[PDB]
Design an enzyme around this catalytic site. Structure first.
Site, PDB file in Angstrom:
ATOM      1  N   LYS A   1     -53.050 -19.151 -21.571  1.00  0.00           N
ATOM      2  CA  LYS A   1     -52.693 -18.680 -22.171  1.00  0.00           C
ATOM      3  C   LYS A   1     -53.516 -19.445 -23.955  1.00  0.00           C
ATOM      4  O   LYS A   1     -52.932 -20.634 -23.103  1.00  0.00           O
ATOM      5  CB  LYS A   1     -52.174 -17.672 -23.409  1.00  0.00           C
ATOM      6  CG  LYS A   1     -51.560 -16.467 -22.990  1.00  0.00           C
ATOM      7  CD  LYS A   1     -50.919 -14.972 -23.400  1.00  0.00           C
ATOM      8  CE  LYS A   1     -52.165 -14.285 -23.751  1.00  0.00           C
ATOM      9  NZ  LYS A   1     -51.280 -13.807 -25.020  1.00  0.00           N
TER      10      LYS A   1
ATOM     11  N   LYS B   1     -27.060 -13.147  -2.859  1.00  0.00           N
ATOM     12  CA  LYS B   1     -27.399 -11.847  -2.950  1.00  0.00           C
ATOM     13  C   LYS B   1     -27.153 -10.924  -1.903  1.00  0.00           C
ATOM     14  O   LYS B   1     -27.342 -10.873  -1.175  1.00  0.00           O
ATOM     15  CB  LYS B   1     -29.532 -12.390  -2.408  1.00  0.00           C
ATOM     16  CG  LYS B   1     -30.010 -11.060  -3.431  1.00  0.00           C
ATOM     17  CD  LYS B   1     -30.804 -11.604  -3.210  1.00  0.00           C
ATOM     18  CE  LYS B   1     -32.163 -10.266  -3.119  1.00  0.00           C
ATOM     19  NZ  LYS B   1     -32.344  -9.467  -2.043  1.00  0.00           N
TER      20      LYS B   1
ATOM     21  N   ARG C   1     -30.697   2.586  -9.064  1.00  0.00           N
ATOM     22  CA  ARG C   1     -32.033   1.849  -9.932  1.00  0.00           C
ATOM     23  C   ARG C   1     -33.416   2.614 -10.029  1.00  0.00           C
ATOM     24  O   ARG C   1     -34.060   2.579 -11.200  1.00  0.00           O
ATOM     25  CB  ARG C   1     -32.404  -0.092  -9.127  1.00  0.00           C
ATOM     26  CG  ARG C   1     -33.373  -0.727 -10.537  1.00  0.00           C
ATOM     27  CD  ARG C   1     -33.825  -1.782  -9.084  1.00  0.00           C
ATOM     28  NE  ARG C   1     -35.327  -1.624  -9.423  1.00  0.00           N
ATOM     29  CZ  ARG C   1     -36.310  -1.580  -8.403  1.00  0.00           C
ATOM     30  NH1 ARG C   1     -36.077  -2.567  -7.315  1.00  0.00           N
ATOM     31  NH2 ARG C   1     -37.502  -1.062  -8.501  1.00  0.00           N
TER      32      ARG C   1
ATOM     33  N   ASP D   1       0.732  -1.216   0.110  1.00  0.00           N
ATOM     34  CA  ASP D   1      -0.110  -0.128  -0.545  1.00  0.00           C
ATOM     35  C   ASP D   1       1.028   1.174  -0.157  1.00  0.00           C
ATOM     36  O   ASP D   1      -0.027   2.601  -0.926  1.00  0.00           O
ATOM     37  CB  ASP D   1      -0.784   0.288   1.492  1.00  0.00           C
ATOM     38  CG  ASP D   1      -1.924  -1.221   1.255  1.00  0.00           C
ATOM     39  OD1 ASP D   1      -2.523  -1.688   0.567  1.00  0.00           O
ATOM     40  OD2 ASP D   1      -2.349  -1.261   2.384  1.00  0.00           O
TER      41      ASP D   1
ATOM     42  N   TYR E   1       2.063   2.100  -3.263  1.00  0.00           N
ATOM     43  CA  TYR E   1       0.898   2.329  -4.072  1.00  0.00           C
ATOM     44  C   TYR E   1       0.828   4.084  -3.909  1.00  0.00           C
ATOM     45  O   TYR E   1       0.829   5.029  -4.261  1.00  0.00           O
ATOM     46  CB  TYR E   1      -0.447   1.508  -4.224  1.00  0.00           C
ATOM     47  CG  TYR E   1      -1.692   2.704  -4.347  1.00  0.00           C
ATOM     48  CD1 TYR E   1      -1.763   2.342  -5.890  1.00  0.00           C
ATOM     49  CD2 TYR E   1      -2.288   3.009  -3.538  1.00  0.00           C
ATOM     50  CE1 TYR E   1      -2.856   3.038  -6.218  1.00  0.00           C
ATOM     51  CE2 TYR E   1      -3.929   4.429  -3.994  1.00  0.00           C
ATOM     52  CZ  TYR E   1      -3.896   3.646  -5.315  1.00  0.00           C
ATOM     53  OH  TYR E   1      -4.704   4.780  -5.698  1.00  0.00           O
ATOM     54  N   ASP E   2       0.881   4.080  -2.189  1.00  0.00           N
ATOM     55  CA  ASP E   2       0.900   6.013  -1.885  1.00  0.00           C
ATOM     56  C   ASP E   2       1.560   6.397  -2.783  1.00  0.00           C
ATOM     57  O   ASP E   2       1.506   7.870  -2.721  1.00  0.00           O
ATOM     58  CB  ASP E   2       0.625   5.787  -0.648  1.00  0.00           C
ATOM     59  CG  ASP E   2       0.372   7.204  -0.242  1.00  0.00           C
ATOM     60  OD1 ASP E   2      -0.895   7.741  -0.855  1.00  0.00           O
ATOM     61  OD2 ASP E   2       0.801   7.859   0.191  1.00  0.00           O
TER      62      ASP E   2
ATOM     63  N   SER F   1     -35.656  -6.052 -11.387  1.00  0.00           N
ATOM     64  CA  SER F   1     -35.681  -6.519  -9.598  1.00  0.00           C
ATOM     65  C   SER F   1     -36.092  -8.006  -9.359  1.00  0.00           C
ATOM     66  O   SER F   1     -36.034  -8.725 -10.425  1.00  0.00           O
ATOM     67  CB  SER F   1     -36.702  -5.715  -8.669  1.00  0.00           C
ATOM     68  OG  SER F   1     -38.289  -6.015  -9.066  1.00  0.00           O
ATOM     69  N   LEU F   2     -36.142  -8.657  -8.566  1.00  0.00           N
ATOM     70  CA  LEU F   2     -36.177  -9.919  -8.674  1.00  0.00           C
ATOM     71  C   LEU F   2     -37.525 -10.251  -7.820  1.00  0.00           C
ATOM     72  O   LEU F   2     -37.458 -10.183  -6.506  1.00  0.00           O
ATOM     73  CB  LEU F   2     -34.749 -10.922  -8.227  1.00  0.00           C
ATOM     74  CG  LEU F   2     -33.613 -10.669  -8.421  1.00  0.00           C
ATOM     75  CD1 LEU F   2     -32.285 -10.687  -7.617  1.00  0.00           C
ATOM     76  CD2 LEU F   2     -33.678 -11.645  -9.985  1.00  0.00           C
TER      77      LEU F   2
ATOM     78  N   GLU G   1     -24.139  -4.121  -7.248  1.00  0.00           N
ATOM     79  CA  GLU G   1     -24.915  -3.841  -6.222  1.00  0.00           C
ATOM     80  C   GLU G   1     -23.698  -2.937  -5.175  1.00  0.00           C
ATOM     81  O   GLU G   1     -22.272  -3.452  -5.235  1.00  0.00           O
ATOM     82  CB  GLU G   1     -25.073  -5.446  -5.340  1.00  0.00           C
ATOM     83  CG  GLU G   1     -26.243  -4.826  -4.087  1.00  0.00           C
ATOM     84  CD  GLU G   1     -27.394  -4.507  -4.677  1.00  0.00           C
ATOM     85  OE1 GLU G   1     -27.645  -4.232  -5.629  1.00  0.00           O
ATOM     86  OE2 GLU G   1     -28.119  -4.726  -3.483  1.00  0.00           O
TER      87      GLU G   1
END
Ligand SMILES: Cc1ccc(Cn2cc(C(N)=O)ccc2=O)c(C)c1
Ligand SMILES: Cc1ccc(Cn2cc(C(N)=O)ccc2=O)c(C)c1
Ligand SMILES: NC(=O)n1nc(-c2ccco2)nc1N
Ligand SMILES: NC(=O)n1nc(-c2ccco2)nc1N
EC number: 6.5.1.2
Lengths: 317, 317
Positions: A315, A116, A137, A32, A35-36, A81-82, A174
């Site tokens: 139907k 989920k 959403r 890290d 990277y910094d 949506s689900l 998400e």
């Protein structure tokens, strides 16, 4: 050519690659601190040569100014949506329904099985590889413009990691807050006589409705992509799991617990395995999202809008 | 009190009652000529004494002026569409799903079974018994204001037939064109070098999108109510079939082929009986709409918006 332009380009490439290793692969090649070092070297050089500052540079995630209000965005493709199930028998009824409804039932019927995530659903648009817009959403037709807040999320790339990005690509996923970040947020909020959050979902929802992106940046949010909306100028894989492997390969974070299962019995084993891992994950999940893997079969099956669970139209053939 | 006011009131009551017998009961107590005699007696008396002309009088169904465009109406309660099934096995899977999902499965599980009318879904609002507004289903959230066109429909009462109407009542149903009217419309259109309609659904859709209600009036449209939306100031029956019997009892047309069936096997017998009657009905149907009759069970089961048929969220208990 100038040496400053080359140094800026090199730093940006190196930093985006380290962000990919750290955030998407969970396998950083450097510490890290390294990277910094490169990060605040880039930041200083850009500020000393502002003519070369780019809007998608790794240093430009936080808009220095809060907004007045959120604008509304109408999704080009509806955002779904689900429907849900609460038992093995109910899940089996959902599979039996598909098996009869399909013109030709394949042997085996493959599902892409995912945890989920209990967060907020978002749509992120990349135009020629650049992050241009992000929306909630909302009601599935219209959502709120949260572009500035989404840019603050450390694991969301500002540019796709590919030399040949699609003309347009809409990533759907998400946004959630892992347990460690949620615990830190509540500790900090209690110490600084500020309001605490009841659970990580509320903490992520609240953080994304914040108007000042300087505040969203201090919230430990993560994206996990679960699908694709718009896609122009690319031949998307023909299975859902391959589409996710493809998003991962171009810089997008995806949940590592996703698996392929053949038939309802293997799917229920995935459900039980994830149910047992709940305690060990480090983030909150609600259940599992079980998806037909074949895209042509998804297209054949289609979707339903505003429909009662208590009625059906049988139907005539 | 004046003799003119009393004559107008008496004519209006008598005419609304004859409209109910003819349109809703299909059992008129007088000939069409007698109904017309009183109709054009009312029309003339109102025109000779315009201070006593009411907007809901039987003579005021057609607004003498075409509109400029349709206004948009946001439904207070979402207006639902239906998911579908194409075989006995698929229908059985839908029932099996409900049986497992319900907290307590009753013995028997009663369904209200209806023909599926192939027309346009509409919402008609009655305020203190008066027809004030009508809208198309649209996307289930917003539709178009078709009040003026709905007022032209002969079997749609301009006022409810009850001395104690609810404060507000929203009737939901299908507007369709029977076979005889459709055949006449196409014969007239062909003779008068006008455009013909391919099928009765197209003829009803086109007639309701007409801006001039003078033209809608010449189209032989019929309503059949299938449910209720808003209902304030009334204790609605607790079963769907009783709600329909209640709408019929206060002046609203309902399809006479509706029946109650207990369990999936009796429901499939209703489906086969209606499938055999298709040829004899005099209007087009697509299939059958099978509804859980108990309203509390409908409320428990709920509805789904924008959801794929190819995925499900199996939630943890
Ligand atoms: C000071 C500091 C810098 C970086 C990080 C985490 N991290 C590491 C890398 C890395 N190793 O390539 C890349 C991006 C990133 O966000 C933390 C937590 C703290
Ligand atoms: C001339 C004329 C008048 C009425 C009708 C049909 N009809 C009859 C009655 C009725 N019998 O109580 C009530 C209303 C109505 O619309 C037709 C087709 C033709
Ligand atoms: N919430 C969550 O984890 N989701 N949600 C979906 C979803 C919503 C619509 C289609 O797929 N997929 C996953 N993994
Ligand atoms: N089209 C038709 O005949 N319908 N449509 C419904 C419906 C739509 C949503 C709930 O119920 N019911 C009947 N009979």
């Amino acid at each position: 050519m100038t040496n400053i332009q080359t140094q800026l380009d090199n730093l940006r490439k190196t930093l985006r690659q380290y962000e990919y290793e750290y955030h998407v692969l969970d396998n950083p090649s450097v510490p890290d601190s390294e990277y910094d070092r490169l990060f605040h070297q880039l930041k200083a050089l850009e500020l000393e040569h502002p003519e070369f500052l780019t809007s998608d540079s790794p240093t430009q995630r936080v808009g220095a100014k809060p907004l007045s209000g959120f604008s509304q965005i109408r999704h080009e493709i509806p955002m779904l949506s689900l429907d849900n199930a609460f038992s093995d028998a109910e899940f089996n009824a959902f599979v039996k329904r598909i098996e009869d409804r399909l013109i030709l039932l394949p042997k085996p019927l493959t599902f892409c099985c995912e945890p989920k995530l209990d967060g907020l659903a978002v749509s992120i648009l990349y135009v020629n590889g650049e992050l241009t817009q992000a929306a909630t959403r909302g009601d599935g037709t219209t959502g709120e413009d949260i572009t500035a807040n989404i840019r603050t999320i450390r694991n969301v790339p500002l540019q796709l990691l590919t030399d040949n990005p699609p003309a347009r690509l809409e990533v759907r996923g998400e946004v959630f807050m892992p347990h460690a970040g949620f615990e830190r947020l509540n500790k900090y909020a209690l110490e600084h006589n500020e309001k605490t959050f009841a659970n990580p979902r509320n903490a992520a929802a609240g953080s994304l409705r914040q108007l000042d992106p300087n505040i969203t940046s201090k919230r430990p949010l993560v994206l996990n992509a679960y699908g694709i909306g718009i896609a122009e100028g690319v031949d998307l894989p023909t299975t859902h799991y391959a589409r996710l492997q493809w998003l991962k390969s171009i810089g997008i974070p995806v949940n590592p617990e996703i698996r392929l299962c053949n038939g309802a019995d293997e799917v229920l084993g995935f459900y039980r395995d994830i149910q047992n891992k709940r305690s060990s994950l480090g983030y909150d999940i609600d259940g599992t999202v079980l998806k037909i893997n074949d895209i042509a079969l998804q297209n054949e099956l289609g979707f339903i809008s505003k429909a009662p669970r208590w009625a059906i139209a049988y139907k005539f053939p």
